[PDB]
Each structure stands twice: as structure tokens, then as C-alpha cells.
């Protein structure tokens, strides 16, 4: 749906792009952040 090949695709791509590059850096980097954040609370809960 990203490739604007066809009709009605002019908008059927402007809504997907945010979730293409957005979900490229979200999950892979959330599993870095989530732990790196759940570990800093063992320094205040201890």
C-alpha cells in the first residue's frame, strides 16, 4: 500500500508511511528502552 501504484492510493499511502518507518524504530528500540527503564526503578525500589 506504500507504493502509490493505482487509484485512490494517493492517500492509501500517506497513512501507512508513519507506521512503516515508525514501527521500524519502535519495537526494536522499545526492547532496549523498556529494560533500560525497568532496571532504573530497581535503584529506587531497593
Amino acid at each position: 500500500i506504500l507504493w502509490g501504484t493505482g487509484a485512490g492510493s494517493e492517500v492509501m499511502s500517506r497513512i501507512a508511511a508513519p507506521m512503516i518507518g515508525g514501527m521500524i524504530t519502535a519495537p526494536l528500540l522499545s526492547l532496549f528502552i523498556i529494560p533500560a527503564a525497568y532496571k532504573l526503578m530497581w535503584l529506587h525500589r531497593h
Binding site: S13, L29, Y38
Partner: protein, 401 residues
């Protein structure tokens, strides 16, 4: 996130949506006051040019308007429909951007300023009563003569305050007239009353209808009129033959003076009084401040003649509303965000992680907007919202683990 988000927003940012249909709409506008003959000829000229480009199959043109309360275009403005050959039949190396480009370069005539738009999108824009400028000024009054001067004198104090501006008193002119100004005293002499003289105007010199033939389901008009030659020119009217009540034989000029003159070509009025507009705007720029600088500016350098007023309205009508109103929703949504995170974890410090680790899902999405070239719109804002939920969905399952 902060570092990449900052210089990644300062990049392009243009108006919101565009939907391209198969066939396209061609609207070319010209000056007002064009004849239904020349305007029709004009329509044929362009249509034959539009046909020149091998990519087009049909061209259904239209000047003026059709018998419907939805169409209201003047002859000076033509709405032409263009259907193109199947996408599989175009020339080897061509697109629609190229087609539209070739059309705008082929189809064009003096005075006729070309323009191209989508059918549906156009129709919407059409019946759309409203104002395009982000900031607009409505000077209403009793007599057009006065208000028209206001706008003129307001434009003078418009290009003297942060923001570009333009008048309107000029957009609303160009109508051509031939005035039969009846002389009551002259007419009286021959025994004719103002109305009597006017008949030779309405019916004699005008294509005035007067009856209908009932032919089955069909119904056609019957109208009285002189021969065209008797009404060719202004002079012709000054020698318009009149058979007075007293069987006297005179000319129209014997009971009236006729003079050519320009004037209004359409009277747009709002609220039952005559109101001329003033279209002021800026490319990009700010909003909630300019109209304030003007409500005090205009009313402090130009005296409003007794019997008129001023009103401010533009594209910020529903802008300042939605905008400010979203600032009354985003807290509600955050307060419902926490209610859902505290609902499955209950650890306060845990909820914070989600509503703060989301920018990663955001920052990465925009770097793709620049690459592909996508534009900034609400559609992208919709994807980014669903994206925020997608990211927050990776966090809840991870925290739980």
C-alpha cells in the same frame, strides 16, 4: 528521539490531502462580461485543443451552467470534463503529471487563465459558500458606494501590518450596460407613462417571453420582439421606433437618453445588506493575533462612515475552535490512557514508561516521510496515532513479561 525529531520537523510541510480520479476536470476562467456566443466559441476552441493530446479519449465541455440549482457558473468560466484513454494506451514514457503538463501547455488562449482540478473535489469547492483567506473582513452597509470605499481604505491599512493583503472591490466589476433612462417629462408629452416606454424595452428590444404552447407533455415558450437589426447597436436603440398611444411616430431617444456604462456583474450580499469582502492572508505564518491587531488597527486610523460595520472571518473559523478544543481532549485522552495502564499494572511508575517511550515509534516514522516524500496531513496524523498504539502494544506485553 529529541535530537532526530527536531531537525526532522523543520523539513517540508504542505497543505493536507489530494485525491486523483481517473478522468480530470478543466476549469479555465476569464474576465467577466463575455457573450454567450464568444463564450460558446471559446468553449469549442479549448475542447478541440484538449483533444489534440493523444492521451485523451473524450472531452465534454461546458460554459455557463446547466438547469440545476447546483450549477451557477458564468460564461466567463468553463467547467470541462476530460476522460483519458485507458492507462494501458498512453504513450510509452508518459504519466498523468506529464499529460496534465502537456494539456496546460497545449490548451491555452489569451485572457483565458487555465486551471486544472479533480471533478468531485471541484464540485465540493463549488457549492462551497465561504472564504478561502485565513483572515477575512466583511464590511457591510446600506449603500454599496460607501462600503466599497471602506474595503479600499482598509486595504491601505492592511499592507501596513504583518501579513500580505488584497482588496475585493475590483473582483466585483466588469459588467457592461446599456442604460435606457426614461425621461418622465419627455414621455408625458406623447402621453406615455414610465411603464409604457419600458414595454418597448422588456418585450420589443428584449427576448421577453409572453406565452407557452401546450404540446402534449412538452411545453415551449413564445416571445415577442423587434427584428434584430432594429437593436444591433446603442445608436440603433436611439432610433428605436415607437408607436405612441396617440398614433404618433417617434424614437426611443425622444422619450429617454441611452448611455453605455460599466458596473456590477453580480451582487453578492450576506445577511440582507450589501457587503464587500477583504481577503487578507499570509503564506504559512500565525493566526490568533493578526485579526486582533486589525480589530484595533482599522478602528484607529480609518473612520467608519455612519451606517456600516466590520466583521472578521476566515479559515480560522473552525481552526481556532478545533485547535483549542483538542487542548480540551488530549488531557481527557491522557487521563484515559493512565486509567488503562494503571488498570493492568497499577504501578504508577510503570504507566509513565509507556506514555514516554512512545516518541520512538514517532521519531522513526517521519524519517520515512522525507525519503518517500510524503506530505504532512491528518491522514499521516491518523497513522501516527495508530502507530502510537502499536508501540504502546509492544510495551504492555514486554512490561508484563
Amino acid at each position: 528521539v529529541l535530537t532526530v525529531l527536531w531537525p526532522l520537523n523543520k523539513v517540508g510541510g504542505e497543505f493536507l490531502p489530494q485525491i486523483n480520479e481517473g478522468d480530470l476536470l478543466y476549469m479555465p476562467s476569464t474576465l467577466p462580461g463575455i457573450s454567450a456566443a464568444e463564450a460558446a466559441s471559446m468553449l469549442q476552441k479549448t475542447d478541440k485543443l484538449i483533444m489534440s493530446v493523444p492521451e485523451v479519449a473524450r472531452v465534454f465541455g461546458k460554459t455557463g451552467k446547466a438547469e440545476t440549482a447546483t450549477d451557477s457558473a458564468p460564461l466567463e468560466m468553463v467547467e470541462t470534463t476530460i476522460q483519458l484513454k485507458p492507462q494501458e494506451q498512453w504513450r510509452p514514457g508518459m504519466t498523468m503529471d506529464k499529460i496534465i503538463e502537456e494539456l496546460d501547455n497545449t490548451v491555452r488562449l489569451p485572457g483565458l487563465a487555465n486551471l486544472w482540478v479533480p471533478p468531485i473535489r471541484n464540485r465540493i469547492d463549488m457549492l462551497s459558500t465561504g472564504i478561502k483567506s485565513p483572515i477575512g473582513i466583511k464590511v457591510s452597509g446600506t449603500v454599496l458606494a460607501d462600503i466599497d470605499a471602506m474595503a479600499e481604505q482598509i486595504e491601505e491599512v492592511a499592507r501596513t501590518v504583518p501579513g500580505v493583503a488584497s482588496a475585493l472591490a475590483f473582483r466585483l466589476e466588469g459588467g457592461r450596460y446599456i442604460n435606457v433612462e426614461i425621461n418622465r417629462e419627455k414621455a408625458a408629452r406623447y402621453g406615455m407613462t414610465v411603464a409604457d416606454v419600458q414595454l418597448f424595452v422588456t418585450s420589443a428590444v428584449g427576448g421577453a417571453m409572453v406565452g407557452e404552447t401546450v404540446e402534449g407533455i412538452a411545453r415551449y415558450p413564445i416571445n415577442l420582439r423587434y427584428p434584430q437589426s432594429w437593436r444591433d447597436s446603442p445608436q440603433a436603440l436611439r432610433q428605436l421606433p415607437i408607436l405612441t398611444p396617440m398614433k404618433q411616430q417617434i424614437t426611443l431617444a425622444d422619450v429617454a437618453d441611452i448611455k453605455v456604462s460599466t458596473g456590477p456583474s453580480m451582487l453578492k450580499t450576506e445577511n440582507a445588506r450589501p457587503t464587500s469582502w477583504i481577503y487578507i492572508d499570509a503564506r504559512d505564518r500565525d493566526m490568533v493575533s493578526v485579526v486582533h491587531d486589525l480589530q484595533k488597527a482599522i478602528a484607529e486610523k480609518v473612520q467608519l462612515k455612519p451606517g456600516t460595520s466590520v466583521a472578521f472571518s476566515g479559515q480560522f473559523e473552525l481552526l481556532e475552535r478545533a485547535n483549542h478544543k483538542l487542548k480540551l481532549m488530549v488531557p481527557m485522552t491522557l487521563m484515559i490512557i493512565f486509567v488503562l495502564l494503571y488498570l493492568a499494572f497499577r504501578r504508577v511508575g510503570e504507566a509513565l514508561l509507556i506514555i514516554s517511550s512512545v516518541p520512538f515509534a514517532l521519531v522513526g516514522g517521519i524519517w520515512l516521510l522525507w525519503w518517500m516524500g510524503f506530505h504532512l496531513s491528518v491522514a499521516t496524523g491518523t497513522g501516527f496515532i495508530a502507530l502510537a498504539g502499536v508501540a504502546a502494544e509492544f510495551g504492555v506485553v514486554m512490561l508484563m513479561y
